Amino acid sequence: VSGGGAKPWRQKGTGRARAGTIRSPIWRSGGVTFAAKPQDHSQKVNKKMYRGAMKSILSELVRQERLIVVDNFSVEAPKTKELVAKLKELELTDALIVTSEVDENLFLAARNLYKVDARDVAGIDPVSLIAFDKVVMTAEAVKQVEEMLA
Amino acid sequence: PRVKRGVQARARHKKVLKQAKGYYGARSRVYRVAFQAVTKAGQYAYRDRRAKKRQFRQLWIARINAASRQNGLSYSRFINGLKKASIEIDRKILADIAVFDKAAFAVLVEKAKAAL
Amino acid sequence: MKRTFQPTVLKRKRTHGFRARMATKNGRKVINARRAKGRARLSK
RNA sequence: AUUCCUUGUCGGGUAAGUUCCGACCUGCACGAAUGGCGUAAUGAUGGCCACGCUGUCUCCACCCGAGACUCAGUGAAAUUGAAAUCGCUGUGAAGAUGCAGUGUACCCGCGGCUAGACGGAAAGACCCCGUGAACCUUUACUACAGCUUGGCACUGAACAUUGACCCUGUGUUGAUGUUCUAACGUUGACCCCUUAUCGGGGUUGCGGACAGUGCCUGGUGGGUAGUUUGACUGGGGCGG
RNA sequence: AUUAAAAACACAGCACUGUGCAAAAUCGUAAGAUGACGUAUACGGUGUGACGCCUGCCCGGUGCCGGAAGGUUAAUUGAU
RNA sequence: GGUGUGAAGUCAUUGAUGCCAUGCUUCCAGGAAAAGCCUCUAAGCUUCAGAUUGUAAGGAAUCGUACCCCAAACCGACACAGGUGGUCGGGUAGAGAAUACCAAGGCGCUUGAGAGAACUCGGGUGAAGGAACUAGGCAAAAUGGUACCGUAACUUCGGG
RNA sequence: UAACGGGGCUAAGUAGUAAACCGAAGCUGCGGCAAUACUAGUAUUGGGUAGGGGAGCGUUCUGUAAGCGGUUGAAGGUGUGUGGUAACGCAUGCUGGACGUAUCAGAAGUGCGAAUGCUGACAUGAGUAACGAUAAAGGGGGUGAAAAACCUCCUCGCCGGAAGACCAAGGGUUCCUGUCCAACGUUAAUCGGGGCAGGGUAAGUCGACCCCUAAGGCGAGGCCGAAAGGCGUAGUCGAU
RNA sequence: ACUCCGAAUACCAGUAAGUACUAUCCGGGAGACACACGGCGGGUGCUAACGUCCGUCGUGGAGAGGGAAACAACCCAGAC
RNA sequence: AACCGACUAAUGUUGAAAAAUUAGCGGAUGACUUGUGGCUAGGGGUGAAAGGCCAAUCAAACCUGGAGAUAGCUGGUUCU
RNA sequence: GGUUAAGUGACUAAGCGUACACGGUGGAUGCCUUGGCAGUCAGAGGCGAUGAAGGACGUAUACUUGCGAUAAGCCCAGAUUAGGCAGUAAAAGCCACUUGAGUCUGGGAUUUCCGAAUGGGGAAACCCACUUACAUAAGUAAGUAUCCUGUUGUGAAUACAUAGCAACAGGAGGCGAACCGGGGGAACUGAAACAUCUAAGUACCCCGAGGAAAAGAAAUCAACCGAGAUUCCGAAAGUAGCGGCGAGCGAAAUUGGACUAGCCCUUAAGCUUUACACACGUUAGACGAACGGUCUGGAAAGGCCGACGAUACAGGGUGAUAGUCCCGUAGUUGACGAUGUGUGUUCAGUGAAAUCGAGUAGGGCGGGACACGUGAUAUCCUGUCUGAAUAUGGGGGGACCAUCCUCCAAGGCUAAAUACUACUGACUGACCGAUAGUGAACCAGUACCGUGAGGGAAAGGCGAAAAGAACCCCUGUGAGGGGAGUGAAAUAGAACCUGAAACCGUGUACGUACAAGCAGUAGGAGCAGGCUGUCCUGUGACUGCGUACCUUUUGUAUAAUGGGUCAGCGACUUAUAUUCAGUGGCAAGGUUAACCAUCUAGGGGAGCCGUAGGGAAACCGAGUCUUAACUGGGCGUU
């Protein structure tokens, strides 16, 4: 904090509580006793623990009937309106759509949709599998996820 | 994240202050004095819940002694009498009877005398 | 009673004035310092 | 202005004098430029005495003013755990408004007083402690500056004496002394840059391998600096 | 300066001592300064403190000055 | 308010700390500097340029200038009983710039009004006594001018 | 008083005998909670500082959450009722006027009565002390909402080697005029060195500038110095 | 600070009943190392001290409740 | 007398005033006093010497930085 | 019935208490934020004699912003288009409306004085000159610093010459938060004292850069196998060592990466310039989808109903909360000119020291640096004194010697990977939200304090909109208020959101003037309100009991400490490593680090831990150590 070099007043005589700096954390306008500095909140996850979690999640999706395997899932134009329709055929509004590779069209068609993400097998995360209400996987992507997760 | 203490800080202070309603001066207005006051009130209240049981029994015994002696027997002899007569009426009841049904008290006294 | 501040302008200038500060290295250090601090008044 | 014992003793002064003056000398513990003893004059100097003078005092009285008091206007302060804030005797972290027992006591101001609130003020200056601090001292420790010593360098030449060594008297080195000039010095003179008591260059004189400086080295070194200087302890020190 | 004005400091006078001038001494790493545009009747340090009468004994200690013979002794040298 | 118009306007005496005087006398501690200024020449220029004396014509810029200054305007945090260099200094009395009373001029100090206790402050007087006070005559009281008279020890011969 | 706690006591003392009773948070009874063992019941256990161990409450922030609640009233504030062993929760009237946020996780600037703590506000002392030289006022009139304090007149008093008049410094518009009186002015104020607006400072001769230099400063080159710089010549500044 | 003798207690060990989560070992975390009074045995002191130093037990510390007028440390007794 | 000073007393001590006022007091042609401007600076200056003074500060100024020195000490340390 | 007597006894409140109601003060809280804080990705990494930073004074029909006597501007070119003439801040006088209104960007012009400040001087923002031109009057303009380097002239003491002097040209000077190299260089502190040592080559001072700097191409390592400059990052490793062997300090070999580049003294690569090209980007910008009705309300973005866009649901604004109202966003486009970049192709330089390294290597003495403190101390630097060899040679390989290996010093240049961000842009946040966040959200490095260096604040919020209260009334043509009016709201009225507490009032109920103390507590009458009296609320006569809290202590009512009160803030954190425990994964295995990466994935096996111990060690090894050897014994085995 700015300033605070000078001793505010003499140690003895004034009748005041001893001070050494106007920027004591006791004083208004003073330091924070334990001022924060920028942190790295990253945690190690073991590679097996990540894969184990991912397998556990996919299994639970299956049992909860949230994993929806489709033969394919493609959008013809980069049009949101088309994707909404396709989703309505699958009778799902909120869904993660995991394909083997994300087409521009499907990526573009999904941007403006909330609670609809288009993700490649590479890009699937532990939270996203949990977060979206359904997970629509193409059968190719299933086989790719299998190899990815062991 | 930074936490401001205001809203909760006030609620604690207010709780104590509300318990100190009726105390004189600072003791109902000022948290530092009220807190001390509400604590000592709790301490007294604990001590007195015990000592209530002593005070009331002393009162009964004093009343029973009055009534027994009006009926010509000491408290000490009357309790012995009743014990010997196997009468297990508590001092709280006896003292109630001595006030509200003087005749019954006299009966009990006569029973007590017979046992002695 | 004679107090410590017995101002003369000339003595103020010759001691604390701009041309006095600018004459010495350490004076220039002061002017630069004050100019960095944002001080409206660099000299007396 | 020194004397412990001590108000020494004697004399003076006073009715009465631990002070004063004179003197004595068993000077605890005067003493001759840290001067000794005198000494006119001087001193907002210390002590003592006297006259005058007086409210200094016996022993205060009265009076004149400025406050204090009252009214109107303005309007602080230190302090403050909270107070429904008595006496006494006792008790008790050992000196009680607050505990016990008891005595006394209608409620509230104003003018006064200061006995208590261990009243207010300033985290006791005393004392101790801290392996605290500072500054001061020295024949504390360790350093350093400065001073100084020698070696080497800048630094040379002739001789003369002499030492060692070398050979066969001879060289090679080392001192020592004299002499010399060419390094070096010059805070002598003159010339020029140049209108210049700086400086530089030139010339010359006087010095001269000296001085002086660098590196190394012994000494000296409270001049300066950093520090250390135990603990127990019927406070602490001293002693142990 | 603001609890001490004095018997404390200074003082003229006195004495010791350093200092031959690029003076000693002091400031400064140095250059350069003061000393002094002075030159021992001067300058510096130390003490004493007008004036009068005086100022005794001790050179073991510690200074300082002088002496160098010997002893001890650094760098250096480098015999064995 | 404005303008208008206006008498006498001398003499003597006294007399500065002002002036002559940056003098004079004397002393030792031995008393700025530099320029303006006068003069002299040098190099240099010699119908010149310059110099002198005169006569016309023109110029002389720029900045300050209010106000306070024994202070309510400066320095003291205050509209603060303090501090702040220099100049001027009338009358009577007086040696005097002391002091008293006044002049010129300036002020009544930015809370008032009552009352007339204790006690505090600053003063006045005091019977009898007179330092008995007190650490101590602290404080008070006292003395206090001029002229003349007169004046001890002591003394370094000045003093005292 | 003050050596029974007091009253008072000749037993209300002392010793004893008999049979009673009072008396604690002890024991029991009744209801409830918890710890630990065992097999929901038993059994035991539950004073507590330093300290160890265990379990929670609430706060801000992230996800959950573009969900959920909200101008048909969020947060906050203030009452009331109610629930739990507690931290606290829930509901709700009034106020308020736009946010809030379940649940489960996650992360902390996560909880204040103390530190002669820090900042702000507001108390107490208290309508108390004091209102700044004891040079001094009195009255008539005026203006004004109002006059002890401003204007004016007549008196009085005070300074007069100053409490007058100037100048330098220093300050900086305080000067003059009109207007205003909130704050400022230790009261009031019509007044003011206050606020606001306008005006006001006229130079060949005063002063500055300027020429000149003192102490001294700076200082081309220079000399010296790790660097920065120091010193200093020629110069150039510098008034008192 | 003598012993021809010599207890009670205490301690060491064994055997045995009953009661008790005791003892021990290895780890994580401490705190504390100013103690006080009372009884008993003593030193010191005056067989003084609300003295001082030990041993040992109790209480206080860290303990409320009742008694001892009031009274940490005494008597009774351990507060979900 | 001015001026410079500061010996005594009283007042004052939340002052009129962070050193004054009042009454007295000393020096008052000198080692005097005063204005303006210069110079000396922190282990440094300056000192007729009091450790005095160097901006109401001095046995080592003030400011900023090292710097959150260190503090075996004191205080304080927040819900159930 | 009266009188008397005795007993008994309400009704007082000067004031005070408690409770409640309504206020005041005050500014907490909540909500909000035009400001901060920390970053990421880019940019640009300098500005200045062509006069900076920063200022002074001016400038339009006080201050801030802009500008500079051409003074909120002038010009020019692009771009843009209905309003504009800066703000406070209204007025006023005006201009303009499809393009000379204006705005935006760029480039020109102008650019007082001060400031390196440079003609000289100087108290910064002032004063005074010389030269040369001009003017004729007593003016105007331009030029005029110092140093360094070079080149020309001149040109002393002595001939020559040199010094000196002058002219000319080209540089430089100052400022800036950090990063960088170098010259100097503390102390507190730690070592539980202190001196070696530490702190620390840190802080600080100085000098010099640059967009980076530095370093760099083996007289290097290694180990008989080999590697191949430098820099940075991960390991090896808190290992070897160093060390009052204390406190502490701390490598390398080797290995995983990032990046890679070498080139010349017979003259190179690179760098800089110069132009010519070309590419290539930047620099004003433009277009930019889709919503109605109804309900609540002051207002609709909310609700209800039904639509519609989405390569656009980033974000902001609009009278509450908006995909569809607005500004934007996605996407698509835009540069005359000016810039930047990268390529060639040129130029003119530089590199550059010339020519392979002698006062050098090595040595002695003194120091210093290397993790290494002089130690047995290799190596490096050098103040001083010395001093080779010179490929048949020399350096190193941790005393030293031999052998062997490896390298070639005494000349140079060299990108990238690396460091930093005062400044510009965009974006992000389990960062702050007005006592916080910057000292500074506000006219803040201001006010204020100080001689000065320097120190250094407080201070946000009416409303959707000022609609900021016409007019009337009291009052001093006041202050302040009451009406009226405005507004959804005026206890939103400018002393303005919310509006806590301390603290102060008014009103009402009850208590209280014979009564002794931590002010309560257990009990309890009476009175007053409700509700309807084995209720609730308020008060509380009277009785019992009862000496605050904190701290510190053997022990505190203590007359020991601290606190006037309230509100706000104020103290076990963070990083890294070691260890123990819980939990999870995997399991005789577990795990990756830097880094790479289409980036929480996946790669990456360097390394670490476990899997064997014993011994000082070599070494041995389910054993080993001890000893001549153990009947043994220590530790281990399981």
TrEMBL record, chain A:
Protein name: Large ribosomal subunit protein uL4
UniProt similarity note: Belongs to the universal ribosomal protein uL4 family.
Gene name per UniProt: rplD
Function field: One of the primary rRNA binding proteins, this protein initially binds near the 5'-end of the 23S rRNA. It is important during the early stages of 50S assembly. It makes multiple contacts with different domains of the 23S rRNA in the assembled 50S subunit and ribosome. Forms part of the polypeptide exit tunnel.
MF terms in GO: rRNA binding; structural constituent of ribosome
Keywords assigned by UniProt, alphabetized: Ribonucleoprotein, Ribosomal protein, RNA-binding, rRNA-binding
Entry keyword Zinc-finger: no
Stretches for region Disordered: 1-15
Coverage span on the entire protein: 51 to 200 of 200
Quaternary state and interactors: Part of the 50S ribosomal subunit.
One of the protein's GO biological processes: translation
From TrEMBL, chain B:
Cited PROSITE patterns: RIBOSOMAL_L20
GO CC aspect terms: ribonucleoprotein complex; ribosome
Keyword annotations: Ribonucleoprotein, Ribosomal protein, RNA-binding, rRNA-binding
InterPro entries, sorted: Ribosomal_bL20, RIBOSOMAL_L20_CS, Ribosomal_protein_bL20_C
Pfam families: Ribosomal_L20
Domain of life: Bacteria
One function term, GO molecular function aspect: rRNA binding
GO BP annotation list: ribosomal large subunit assembly; translation
Free-text function comment from the UniProt entry: Binds directly to 23S ribosomal RNA and is necessary for the in vitro assembly process of the 50S ribosomal subunit. It is not involved in the protein synthesizing functions of that subunit.
Protein family: Belongs to the bacterial ribosomal protein bL20 family.
Protein name, entry field: Large ribosomal subunit protein bL20
Protein source organism: Vibrio natriegens NBRC 15636 = ATCC 14048 = DSM 759
Automatic annotation (TrEMBL), chain C:
Gene Ontology molecular functions: structural constituent of ribosome
Entry keyword Ribosomal protein: yes
Gene Ontology biological-process entries: translation
Cited Gene3D superfamilies: 1.10.287.3980
Keywords recorded for this protein, A-Z: Ribonucleoprotein, Ribosomal protein
UniProt keyword Ribonucleoprotein present: yes
InterPro entries from the UniProt entry: Ribosomal_bL34, Ribosomal_bL34_CS
GO cellular component: ribonucleoprotein complex; ribosome
Lineage: superkingdom: Bacteria
Family indicated by similarity: Belongs to the bacterial ribosomal protein bL34 family.
NCBIfam families, sorted: rpmH_bact
Classification via PANTHER family: LARGE RIBOSOMAL SUBUNIT PROTEIN BL34M, MITOCHONDRIAL RIBOSOMAL PROTEIN 34 FAMILY MEMBER
Name by which UniProt lists this protein: Large ribosomal subunit protein bL34
Organism: Vibrio natriegens NBRC 15636 = ATCC 14048 = DSM 759
